[PDB]
Amino acid sequence: RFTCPEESEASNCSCEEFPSKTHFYCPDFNPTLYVDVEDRMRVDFKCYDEPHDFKSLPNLAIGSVKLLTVVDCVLDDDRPILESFKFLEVADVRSFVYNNHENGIRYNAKYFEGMEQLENLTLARGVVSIDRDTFSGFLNLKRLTIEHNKLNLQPGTFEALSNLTYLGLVYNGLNEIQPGLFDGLESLEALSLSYNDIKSLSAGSFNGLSSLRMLNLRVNKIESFDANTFASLKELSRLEITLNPFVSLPRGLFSENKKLKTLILTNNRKLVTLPEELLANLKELTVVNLSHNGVGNLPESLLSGSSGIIELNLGYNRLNSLPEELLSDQPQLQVLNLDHNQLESIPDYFLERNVELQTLYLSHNRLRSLSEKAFTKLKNLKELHLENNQLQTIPQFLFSGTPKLEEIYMQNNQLALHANSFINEELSIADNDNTPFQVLQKLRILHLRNNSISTIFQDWYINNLEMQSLDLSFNKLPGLSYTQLQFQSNITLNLSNNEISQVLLIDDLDLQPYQRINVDLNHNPLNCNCNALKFIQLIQSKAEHGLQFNVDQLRCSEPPNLLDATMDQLQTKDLLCDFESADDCPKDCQCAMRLLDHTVIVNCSGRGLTEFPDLPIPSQLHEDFNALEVHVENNRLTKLPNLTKHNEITQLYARNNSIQNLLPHNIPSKLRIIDLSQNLLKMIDDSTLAQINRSSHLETIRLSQNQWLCDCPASSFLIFVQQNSRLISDMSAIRCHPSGKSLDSITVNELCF
Amino acid sequence: FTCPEESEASNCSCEEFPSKTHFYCPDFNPTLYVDVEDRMRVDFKCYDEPHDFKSLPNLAIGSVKLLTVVDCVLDDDRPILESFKFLEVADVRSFVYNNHENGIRYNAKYFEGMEQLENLTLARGVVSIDRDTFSGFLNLKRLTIEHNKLNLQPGTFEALSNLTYLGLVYNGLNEIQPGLFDGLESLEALSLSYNDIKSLSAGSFNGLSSLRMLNLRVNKIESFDANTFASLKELSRLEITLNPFVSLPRGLFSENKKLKTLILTNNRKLVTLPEELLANLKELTVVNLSHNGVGNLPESLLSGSSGIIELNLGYNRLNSLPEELLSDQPQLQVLNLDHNQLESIPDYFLERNVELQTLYLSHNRLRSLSEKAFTKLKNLKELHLENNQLQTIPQFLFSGTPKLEEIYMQNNQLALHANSFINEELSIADNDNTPFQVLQKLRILHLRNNSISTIFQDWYINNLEMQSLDLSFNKLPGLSYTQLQFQSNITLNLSNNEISQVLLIDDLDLQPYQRINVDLNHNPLNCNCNALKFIQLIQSKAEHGLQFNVDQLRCSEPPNLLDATMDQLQTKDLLCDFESADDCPKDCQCAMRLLDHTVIVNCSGRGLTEFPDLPIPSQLHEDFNALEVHVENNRLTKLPNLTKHNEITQLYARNNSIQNLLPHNIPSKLRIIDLSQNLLKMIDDSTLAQINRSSHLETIRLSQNQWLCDCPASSFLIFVQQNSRLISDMSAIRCHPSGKSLDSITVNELCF
Ligand SMILES: *[C@@H]1O[C@H](CO)[C@@H](O[C@@H]2O[C@H](CO)[C@@H](O)[C@H](O)[C@H]2NC(C)=O)[C@H](O)[C@H]1NC(C)=O
Numbered sequence A: 001r002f003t004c005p006e007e008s009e010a011s012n013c014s015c016e017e018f019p020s021k022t023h024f025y026c027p028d029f030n031p032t033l034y035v036d037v038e039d040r041m042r043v044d045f046k047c048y049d050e051p052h053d054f055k056s057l058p059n060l061a062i063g064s065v066k067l068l069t070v071v072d073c074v075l076d077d078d079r080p081i082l083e084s085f086k087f088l089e090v091a092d093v094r095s096f097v098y099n100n101h102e103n104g105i106r107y108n109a110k111y112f113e114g115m116e117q118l119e120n121l122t123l124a125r126g127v128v129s130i131d132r133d134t135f136s137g138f139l140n141l142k143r144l145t146i147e148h149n150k151l152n153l154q155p156g157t158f159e160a161l162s163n164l165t166y167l168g169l170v171y172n173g174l175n176e177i178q179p180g181l182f183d184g185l186e187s188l189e190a191l192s193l194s195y196n197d198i199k200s201l202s203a204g205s206f207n208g209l210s211s212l213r214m215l216n217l218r219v220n221k222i223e224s225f226d227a228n229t230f231a232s233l234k235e236l237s238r239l240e241i242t243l244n245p246f247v248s249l250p251r252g253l254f255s256e257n258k259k260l261k262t263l264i265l266t267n268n269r270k271l272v273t274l275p276e277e278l279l280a281n282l283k284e285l286t287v288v289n290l291s292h293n294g295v296g297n298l299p300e301s302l303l304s305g306s307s308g309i310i311e312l313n314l315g316y317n318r319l320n321s322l323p324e325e326l327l328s329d330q331p332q333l334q335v336l337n338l339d340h341n342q343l344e345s346i347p348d349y350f351l352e353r354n355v356e357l358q359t360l361y362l363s364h365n366r367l368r369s370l371s372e373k374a375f376t377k378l379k380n381l382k383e384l385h386l387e388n389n390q391l392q393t394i395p396q397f398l399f400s401g402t403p404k405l406e407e408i409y410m411q412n413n414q415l416a417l418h419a420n421s422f423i424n425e426e427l428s429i430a431d432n433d434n435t436p437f438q439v440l441q442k443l444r445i446l447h448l449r450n451n452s453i454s455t456i457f458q459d460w461y462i463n464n465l466e467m468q469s470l471d472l473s474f475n476k477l478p479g480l481s482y483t484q485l486q487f488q489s490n491i492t493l494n495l496s497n498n499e500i501s502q503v504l505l506i507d508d509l510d511l512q513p514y515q516r517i518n519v520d521l522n523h524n525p526l527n528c529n530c531n532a533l534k535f536i537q538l539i540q541s542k543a544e545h546g547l548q549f550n551v552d553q554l555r556c557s558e559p560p561n562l563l564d565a566t567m568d569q570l571q572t573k574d575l576l577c578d579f580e581s582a583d584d585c586p587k588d589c590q591c592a593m594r595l596l597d598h599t600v601i602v603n604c605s606g607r608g609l610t611e612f613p614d615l616p617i618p619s620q621l622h623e624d625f626n627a628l629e630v631h632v633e634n635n636r637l638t639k640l641p642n643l644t645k646h647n648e649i650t651q652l653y654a655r656n657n658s659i660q661n662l663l664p665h666n667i668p669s670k671l672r673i674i675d676l677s678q679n680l681l682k683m684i685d686d687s688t689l690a691q692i693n694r695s696s697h698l699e700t701i702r703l704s705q706n707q708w709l710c711d712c713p714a715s716s717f718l719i720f721v722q723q724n725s726r727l728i729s730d731m732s733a734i735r736c737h738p739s740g741k742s743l744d745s746i747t748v749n750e751l752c753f
Numbered sequence B: 001f002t003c004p005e006e007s008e009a010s011n012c013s014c015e016e017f018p019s020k021t022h023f024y025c026p027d028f029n030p031t032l033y034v035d036v037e038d039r040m041r042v043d044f045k046c047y048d049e050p051h052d053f054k055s056l057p058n059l060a061i062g063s064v065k066l067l068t069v070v071d072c073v074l075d076d077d078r079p080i081l082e083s084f085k086f087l088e089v090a091d092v093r094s095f096v097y098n099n100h101e102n103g104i105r106y107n108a109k110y111f112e113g114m115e116q117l118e119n120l121t122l123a124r125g126v127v128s129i130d131r132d133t134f135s136g137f138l139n140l141k142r143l144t145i146e147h148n149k150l151n152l153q154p155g156t157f158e159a160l161s162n163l164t165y166l167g168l169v170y171n172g173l174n175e176i177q178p179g180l181f182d183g184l185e186s187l188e189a190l191s192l193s194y195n196d197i198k199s200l201s202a203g204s205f206n207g208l209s210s211l212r213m214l215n216l217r218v219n220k221i222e223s224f225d226a227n228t229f230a231s232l233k234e235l236s237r238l239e240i241t242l243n244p245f246v247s248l249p250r251g252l253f254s255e256n257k258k259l260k261t262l263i264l265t266n267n268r269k270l271v272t273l274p275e276e277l278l279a280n281l282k283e284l285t286v287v288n289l290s291h292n293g294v295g296n297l298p299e300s301l302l303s304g305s306s307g308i309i310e311l312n313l314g315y316n317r318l319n320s321l322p323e324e325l326l327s328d329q330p331q332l333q334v335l336n337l338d339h340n341q342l343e344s345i346p347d348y349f350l351e352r353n354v355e356l357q358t359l360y361l362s363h364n365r366l367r368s369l370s371e372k373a374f375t376k377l378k379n380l381k382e383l384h385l386e387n388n389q390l391q392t393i394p395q396f397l398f399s400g401t402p403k404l405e406e407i408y409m410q411n412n413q414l415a416l417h418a419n420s421f422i423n424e425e426l427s428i429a430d431n432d433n434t435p436f437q438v439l440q441k442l443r444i445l446h447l448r449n450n451s452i453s454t455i456f457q458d459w460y461i462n463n464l465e466m467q468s469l470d471l472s473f474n475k476l477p478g479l480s481y482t483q484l485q486f487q488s489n490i491t492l493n494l495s496n497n498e499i500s501q502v503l504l505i506d507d508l509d510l511q512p513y514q515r516i517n518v519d520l521n522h523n524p525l526n527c528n529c530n531a532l533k534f535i536q537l538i539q540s541k542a543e544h545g546l547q548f549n550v551d552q553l554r555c556s557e558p559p560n561l562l563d564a565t566m567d568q569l570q571t572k573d574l575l576c577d578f579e580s581a582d583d584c585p586k587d588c589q590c591a592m593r594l595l596d597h598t599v600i601v602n603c604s605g606r607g608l609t610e611f612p613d614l615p616i617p618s619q620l621h622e623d624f625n626a627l628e629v630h631v632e633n634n635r636l637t638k639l640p641n642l643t644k645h646n647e648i649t650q651l652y653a654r655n656n657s658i659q660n661l662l663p664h665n666i667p668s669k670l671r672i673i674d675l676s677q678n679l680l681k682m683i684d685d686s687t688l689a690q691i692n693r694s695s696h697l698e699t700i701r702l703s704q705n706q707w708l709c710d711c712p713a714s715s716f717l718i719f720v721q722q723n724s725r726l727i728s729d730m731s732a733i734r735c736h737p738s739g740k741s742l743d744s745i746t747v748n749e750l751c752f
């Protein structure tokens, strides 16, 4: 265990012992450097300023340590690093990491006079002009990295490293690879040349490497190859060539890499063509990644014989008009990508040979219509993508041979799919439509966003039993009914941004006992007129029903009503229903009925007439409904509405009325609310008022703007007012015709005696 | 997610890994890379001139909570989002801006569009901040400014008023102006380390009320004010390290009742501590005073604080101690006094402390421990006494601590011996004074680098729970099997000792399957006959209980070549000089070997006609018996059996030539005789019978034989040849005195 050195005046370095790693700051006044030391795992030495004074240090005692990470600290000129770091006697060090920024250091064997048994090594930002003799003294060195330094390597610097395993030459900006730079690397298994400026790779560039398994040229400036560039790498298995600017690959580049397993060739822009049988006869090959290139057409024999492929990516090219038999020899192919390829159409027999194929991509192409035989023998297909195409429709037998299709994506298309699109030849054998989704019982997720869908097919809730999502946004849905909601699984049936004018529901919900059945209904020109009441009563009332509509953004589309109103702040009383089917309603009157309250409105208040308009009987059933509400406020010349007898009116409003000389014939059977404003109250008689009875329903009368004579012949009116005080809206406002003042003060004067 | 479609009229490309999608602009060379998560992060770093991202194609990436910029230059006045508009990210909840390129004078215009930002961080780029620069955020929880020289106005932070974590690290602040923290009501950390604050005024923390965990880890603080911390009623932690001040004001922490953790270390100039500095701190839990320069302490330093569970006082310059320094701390758990200059411990130091689990006293200069030092420690678990000057241990040192588990006594002047504790009072002739019998559960004990004489039997008798032990660099005289009586998986260590010899019983065994490890490396272990049992134990065996590590073992003054290895050990090399002066001649002693089981003189010497007669050195206690003859390649006067040859179990001669041999001269009591370079081939009466097949290794050899021809000896030669199978006669036999009389010669041939 390493503990802090005993405090003394000989040394000014302050050791702060932490539970994990003992810390240091040797110049106590100004800690220009700190030495974070673990027990025996690592040593972290970093300098912050120009002065070094390594000789004026307490001579720490660490002993054996695995990793020695020195950062941004100077080295003595042409002296061993362990000699320049004598103030800590690190020994038996395996890994050495040297970050250095201020000054580049020319390297020779004299800098490594203490690291004969070094396993790992790393250099960064500070190494320039490595000498050929630098690595001679090393024994059993397995890794080497030259990280972020501008460098130029003469051929032969690595000849002394026989046992080297991983070599990293990233970011060095090498201009070119001399033939024979890797002479001594006989046991090399991996190599990296990413982020360099290698102009070209000659035939003899990779001489001396035979057991190499991985290669890496991720970012270079390679303008051309040679036909025998990779011929010397018989053991190659992984190859990464990205972001290179070359125009084409030479014929037969991989003629000898029979052990190839993965080939990542992506973003190699300006790669317009691929040579004939580039990847032929590679049994071990399993993953091919040719995305983001600029290829315009693939040769037919590109993959002839490579039966071991399981993943083939070809996205983001300019690849159109695929050859028919390109994928004939790949029976293990699992994932195929063809997106962003500008494909106008694919050959009918393109995918017949692949009996097994899990996931297929065809998105972002320019497909117009899929062939019926495209998916005949894909018995293992699971995920299908067809988004962002120019599809008009789909053949009726398109999914006959893919019964295991879990998820499908058809968004951003021009699919029509009318209700009668797949109507049978008048057979009528099956109630469900003949849409191709009928055989897809395994379907789970379906997307149809941004389409021209104009219905919800019956097979989407009858045959598909495990459906759990059905996106139908931005397509021309005409309406919604309760039948189409008869799903048998938790489904988030999205229906936003459709032309859903109206929706119909029944008061009883047959939903199975489960969590919920969401229906997103945000932006629709919903008609808040008749036939929508039960939906409104459902949404506004709080209940534990399965249906959970999301109508927070939903508004109405009725100019007569409050347009742009929300249901959460909508008066359900104001729902109205026009009587368009009937023609016996009085002319020049707003004819409608409200189903919630069970009322029918005549609304002849707009016009003024000489007689009471004929009020049609509620011949329309309206669920066996027998009450009428009439507004006749403007008409004040009828002189009698005596047709009210043998009628079922329940509301009456006469803001302006003729002289109130009415007979008991006018007295109605079922009138709840009555208004007699702006009339001659003097003409009315007690016998008519006596026959008024609240037994049928509650009675409320209006005495506003009414003039009634007060005298002995007009007696008992005050008693009737007192009895009907609740009926009278303002009994005090009722006044004698000549006096114009309330008769309450003169109630004692009412009695003649 | 999906990279931009078709990459048309764009010089920047997408990688689209399954975890995150990278970007570069490699049209000529990729200067900058942008990699994004689904919604978590966006990292943006550029490595060249800013003109390379003047008009990049817009990425239109979804808004992500965390944004990062590295070494990217931006314009003088336009906001950050406007400069990086091509990213098209708006919902930012974390911003980090590393900028090594060029300092920029921040104005309030830079952060428009981030009115919901948190975890704002400005590293290495800020040079100066104008007032109300942070105004407008309206909700900020964490801020950090680091690695950049600064000089701030008092009213810079007034606008925030919701900040909880503030960090001004390595900013090179010359000093703290009063009221510079005025507007930070809800602050809860400062992290003012690595600055250059010269001193703290009384009003240096005016605007802070909900503060906790004030940090001053590295500063050039020269002095403190009396009421520096008075303005902070709530203050949980306080870290004040690596400062050049010489003393603290009296009553510095008077008003901070909530003080829970005071870390005050590495103040090399802090010569003394004020009295009752820690007074009346009930909530205090851990206090750290290590690595200071304090030389003396006041009596009332910790008065009125019973909540202390940890107290570190190590690496200081303490020379004396107060008596009641820990009177008011009955809840203490650990006490560190290591690396100080303490020469003694007060007798009444720890009567009132009972929850102490571990007590550290290493690297001090203690002369001895008082008997009642540990009298009241009912929960002591670990004890350290390393690098001290302890002479001996009192007999009742561990009387009051039965819970003790580990003990460390390295690098001490300990001189424990067999009679260092034995007293005639109540003597039981065993377990002298019981120095360690009171510790039942003593697991680990280190006595490395001491002057202990002998192993106390108490370690191997009643310390059943012992798991390890180390007696290296100690003056142990020897080892015996009786010392190995442990009842657990003990790993005893005796490396580099003065053990002359080990006496191990041949029938040593242990019933349990638990293993015992013993190391004798660098021990003299002189190799004599008694070491034969140790040699056998070291020899490879199928299974054993005492696994010996003897790779670096050496033999003291060896009879054989010096620095002999155990790989070259042999049974014959086990022979040792006998201690019986009368029994063996003074010229050379009897071998009396045990493994070899042979007795022979080491040197031939002058020689005698008759070998001396001595009793068997083994005396029936060993298989050892005389089997060899010292005389070799010498003209012996005679070889008589009565000259102890009969007493010798066997006879072995080397290049000894006898002209005449007789049956009387041949030893009958000896099982067999072996001779070489004999001058006579005649067969004696004893030679007429073949020596015993078993228990008689010595025999006759055809080689190095001289034939003698005589008619009477022909029958004896015939009898010898009948038993002989190597050859009819000697290979180098050329004798024919007018006839054939050799053993190969037939009966018909005669000597004449
Ligand atoms: C030299 O570096 C390599 C890679 O950095 C180290 O490899 C380790 O390998 C083991 C094998 O499973 C992994 O678990 C570790 O995570 C790897 N380490 C690292 C840092 O990636 C190797 O250990 C290093 N050699 C020494 C002596 O430290």
Ligand SMILES: *[C@@H]1O[C@H](CO)[C@@H](O[C@@H]2O[C@H](CO)[C@@H](O)[C@H](O)[C@H]2NC(C)=O)[C@H](O)[C@H]1NC(C)=O
Pocket: A412, A413, A450
């Ligand atoms: C819905 O899909 C239509 C497809 O027409 C999108 O409208 C654009 O149509 C033109 C046709 O010439 C395409 O070139 C464009 O790419 C389409 N726009 C986009 C953004 O892809 C329309 O934008 C889509 N609506 C969405 C996705 O909300």
Ligand SMILES: *[C@@H]1O[C@H](CO)[C@@H](O[C@@H]2O[C@H](CO)[C@@H](O)[C@H](O)[C@H]2NC(C)=O)[C@H](O)[C@H]1NC(C)=O
Pocket: B065, B066, B093, B094, B118, B119, B142
């Ligand atoms: C801003 O930083 C804070 C502090 O790191 C984050 O909050 C969490 O803080 C705790 C502190 O104990 C950490 O252990 C967590 O890891 C932090 N959360 C995360 C997600 O890292 C906070 O999340 C940060 N803000 C954002 C938007 O990431």
Ligand SMILES: *[C@@H]1O[C@H](CO)[C@@H](O[C@@H]2O[C@H](CO)[C@@H](O)[C@H](O)[C@H]2NC(C)=O)[C@H](O)[C@H]1NC(C)=O
Pocket: B387, B411, B412, B413, B449, B473
């Ligand atoms: C064993 O302990 C002794 C002392 O207990 C060590 O000797 C001391 O070494 C230091 C090293 O600077 C000197 O300052 C002291 O004066 C020495 N004291 C004595 C009494 O010699 C010794 O180094 C330790 N190790 C060994 C292997 O003996």
Ligand SMILES: *[C@@H]1O[C@H](CO)[C@@H](O)[C@H](O)[C@H]1NC(C)=O
Pocket: A138, A139, A140, A141, A160, A161, A162, A163
């Ligand atoms: C390589 O390893 C082998 C065996 O591990 C060893 O014999 C040889 O000396 C090593 N060479 C170098 C240069 O380390």
Ligand SMILES: *[C@@H]1O[C@H](CO)[C@@H](O)[C@H](O)[C@H]1NC(C)=O
Pocket: A488, A489, A490, A512, A514, A515, A516
């Ligand atoms: C819907 O999800 C809930 C969640 O617990 C589950 O209990 C219920 O069974 C699901 N619906 C069906 C039809 O399984």
Ligand SMILES: *[C@@H]1O[C@H](CO)[C@@H](O)[C@H](O)[C@H]1NC(C)=O
Pocket: A588, A589, A590, A603, A604, A605, A606, A607, A631
């Ligand atoms: C219908 O009723 C409303 C209610 O206020 C009234 O304003 C309107 O004039 C009526 N219309 C007709 C034609 O009577």
Ligand SMILES: *[C@@H]1O[C@H](CO)[C@@H](O)[C@H](O)[C@H]1NC(C)=O
Pocket: B137, B138, B139, B159, B160, B161, B162
């Ligand atoms: C702190 O946050 C609250 C919560 O939104 C806000 O109202 C207040 O204005 C913020 N304080 C400042 C100074 O912006």
